[PDB]
Structures are given as C-alpha cells and as structure tokens.
Scaffold this active site. Sequence first.
Site, PDB file in Angstrom:
ATOM      1  CD  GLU A  29       4.502  16.056 -32.428  1.00  0.00           C
ATOM      2  OE1 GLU A  29       5.748  16.056 -31.511  1.00  0.00           O
ATOM      3  OE2 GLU A  29       4.382  16.616 -33.415  1.00  0.00           O
TER       4      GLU A  29
ATOM      5  CG  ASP B  17      11.698  19.999 -30.955  1.00  0.00           C
ATOM      6  OD1 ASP B  17      12.885  20.359 -31.100  1.00  0.00           O
ATOM      7  OD2 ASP B  17      10.765  20.735 -31.153  1.00  0.00           O
TER       8      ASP B  17
END
Length: 164
Positions: A11, A20
């Site tokens: 991440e 994202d």
Amino acid sequence: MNIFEMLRIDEGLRLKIYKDTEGYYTIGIGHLLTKSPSLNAAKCELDKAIGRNTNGVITKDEAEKLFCQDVDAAVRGILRNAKLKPVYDSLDCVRRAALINMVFQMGETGVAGFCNSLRMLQQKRWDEAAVNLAKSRWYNQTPNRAKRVITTFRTGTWDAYKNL
C-alpha cells in the site's frame, strides 16, 4: 515479515490525500476515504477519521493508527463472513495474511464471491488455487501485487516480500 509489513509494502505510505489505483481518495497506508469524486467529501471523511481539522495532511503516527484499525477491521469482517471464515480458519499464519491482504484491498464481499479459488485454498490445492486466483480483474489491474499475494498462497512463505 508480517501482515503489517506486507501491507505496508503493497500500500505504501503517503501523508497527504492521494488517489488509489482505482482513482479513489485515500491517505496513509491505503486508507480509503470515500468513493465520492468530491475532494471536499474526502476531507470530511478524513477529519472525522482523525478527530481534528487536518486540511488533508496527517502524521505518520496517525496513518499507522488508521492502519491498525483497518487491518483489524479486515480480520473482523473475515471472521463474520460465512464464506471467508472457514477458509481463513483452515489456513496457516502466512496464508492467512495473504487472505487479509486481499480483503484489505477489495473488501469482504468481492473476495467472498470467488467460490472456486476459495474452495481450492480450503482443499490446500495450492498451485491450482494460484492459477485460479490469476483469472481475475484483481490480477490484471494490479498484477505485481497480485503475483506477490498469489505466491504467498502458493508457497506459504514470505518469499515474494523479500528484497522489498
């Protein structure tokens, strides 16, 4: 290596609101704020999540606290899900982390629907499960991460997270 270090690799860590891989406003270690296209909406979510007026920027401690909560929430949701809990309970510690990683990324509902991959994991047919997991939007859209998670399911080792 452990689930925290593994998700930190997959991440990243960013202290300002970012989009994202799906275009959604996120902060920290992959903390999804909202699917709304409104940055203002994301900012409300962020201040609510942190408990102060953040103006879109948080500290590393704050990011790690959201991450603590998010990992726990992923595990809790696995344990509450009739499709995922039997798979999770059947797995060793390393492969459990691979399942947590998937749920963190895609949510409990999406993972819970992979009835063939889940069955193959429950049957401990690791190479078969690995082939089947790659027949997915997940693998095609995030192949490097999916390859690491799949190698973790295939081998029950952290080998795909070494040198990272």
